Ligand SMILES: O=C(O)CC[C@]1(C(=O)O)N[C@H](C(=O)O)Cc2c1[nH]c1ccccc21
């Protein structure tokens with residue numbers, strides 16, 4: 218459907234998109250940002266592309282709902298998309314805006330529209346992944362400070378390796394979807410709002426049901442969860458949190474390897490919040 | 504009114520800062536880990552409530568499209584809303600997430616659903632308005648530097664600056680009628696933080712009017728009045744240049760003999776939104 222987006226998705230799994238490089242260095246054409254700075258444009262670029270990616274996934278889900286006609290889906294997309302994609306096109310993402318218009322073109326079938334949305338969502342998810350990695354989350358930390366399928370996870374250049382287990386029965390189609398994407402190597406980043414957890418944008422768009430979920434605060438060390446709605450992310454719980462929402466249970470790092478995760482979470486913290494030195498997560502079947 | 508408490512909160516929040524915004528911007532959201540800082544949660548709260556409001560208006564626009572059934576719309580809302588509202592409910596806006604659920608309930612007619620969406624949209628619009636005013640836009644200021652004719656009156660306090668203006672009632676007729684029906688109002692005046700020298704103020708209405716007559720922003724004269732429904736139903740005042748080649752509905756113009764009075768306001772308004780956060784209040788009234 219969108220063969221060029223497929224090539225860019227394959228490239229950006231290991232290479233920084235030039236869109237993200239220009240935004241974070243303040244070299245976007247036509248210089249966005251009032252009065253000689255580009256932080257405000259950087260703030261809008263990072264957050265809008267993220268929330269745009271959230272809309273695109275929920276629209277992909279809507280494309281699977283057969284109670285809504287294909288013509289209605291296109292009507293919903295043509296109304297909700299432009300205010301986001303037009304701004305993103307003039308603020309660092311011209312290719313994004315290009316294929317946003319193309320996704321909204323008339324579709325011959327629900328399968329074609331779903332194929333556009335699924336491919337376009339993964340492409341925007343990867344732009345969000347890189348944008349999240351390079352956004353200066355510690356900029357305000359100075360003056361806003363408070364008072365059983367076996368698999369293998371590897372973090373480089375840390376060199377840490379752990380064995381894990383995918384639960385293929387709890388969320389069957391979800392586990393199947395993640396297992397189908399193996400092996401992959403993507404950037405490993407940290408949560409920036411809440412919890413001692415890290416997530417990595419995995420190369421897939423799963424619309425599987427998630428009947429089996431577990432409260433985050435009760436998630437054990439080494440818990441493998443997955444978040445479709447925030448970008449199809451593999452999440453590793455390495456420490457405590459008080460958030461009471463529930464996340465789909467994907468798997469668990471084995472008991473004898475779970476104590477190895479604390480040093481990963483600390484380094485992944487340092488990279489997401491400060492140094493921006495890449496940490497690469499590899500997930501593979503054993 | 505479908506959600507009358509929201510209407511009450513609308514009336515209050517035009518003049519008073521919502522307690523949620525003050526709690527977020529001071530890091531005092533109760534029981535809210537953020538690793539010994541509250542900037543990141545502030546960053547997500549501000550941007551997500553703004554983009555949530557952007558989705559809600561497009562859903563309000565969809566509510567006037569009779570080719571999409573009311574049942575297909577409620578299906579659309581029930582799928583798109585929770586990822587936004589549940590996050591906002593746990594990060595400072597419990598009342599917003601509480602009423603987001605009531606928006607998605609079964610509706611007896613299209614008019615009842617549109618009334619829910621329009622009211623909820625204006626409520627989240629005012630939350631976004633205050634969050635925009637108080638967000639620390641100067642945080643990266645140092646680190647990331649580059650190398651017929653309807654007569655109306657606009658007054659900015661505490662400056663006391665005053666300009667007469669004309670509303671172009673025959674170009675975007677339904678938009679002009681919607682804006683004129685909201686007069687008089689007094690709202691917070693804030694500055695654009697991305698696209699240069701314009702200032703906008705979230706106006707107390709949700710217009711679903713068509714916007715046929717648009718003019719390139721780079722071509723708008725000093726004193727041009729424009730209006731943006733999709734970014735929060737904002738009255739926009741042009742006072743400086745811009746290279747934006749984008750479209751914006753033409754609403755009116757500050758009269759020629761008063762255009763010199765806008766530079767000092769735009770300078771003072773920028774000082775507020777960007778660093779000082781001292782409120783500048785805009786009153787728009789008929790003449
Ligand atoms: O943090 C929360 O309150 C919710 C949990 C959450 C996650 O599932 O990863 N945390 C992320 C982070 O910390 O970066 C941000 C985030 C989460 N859900 C979200 C839903 C919508 C937008 C953003 C988020």
Ligand SMILES: O=C(O)CC[C@]1(C(=O)O)N[C@H](C(=O)O)Cc2c1[nH]c1ccccc21
Nearest residue numbers: 300301304307308695696697698699731734
């Ligand atoms: O900035 C741009 O590139 C577009 C012009 C714009 C405006 O309509 O006022 N500027 C605003 C600002 O600077 O705060 C941000 C903004 C604008 N459209 C938008 C559309 C969607 C989201 C955000 C914006």
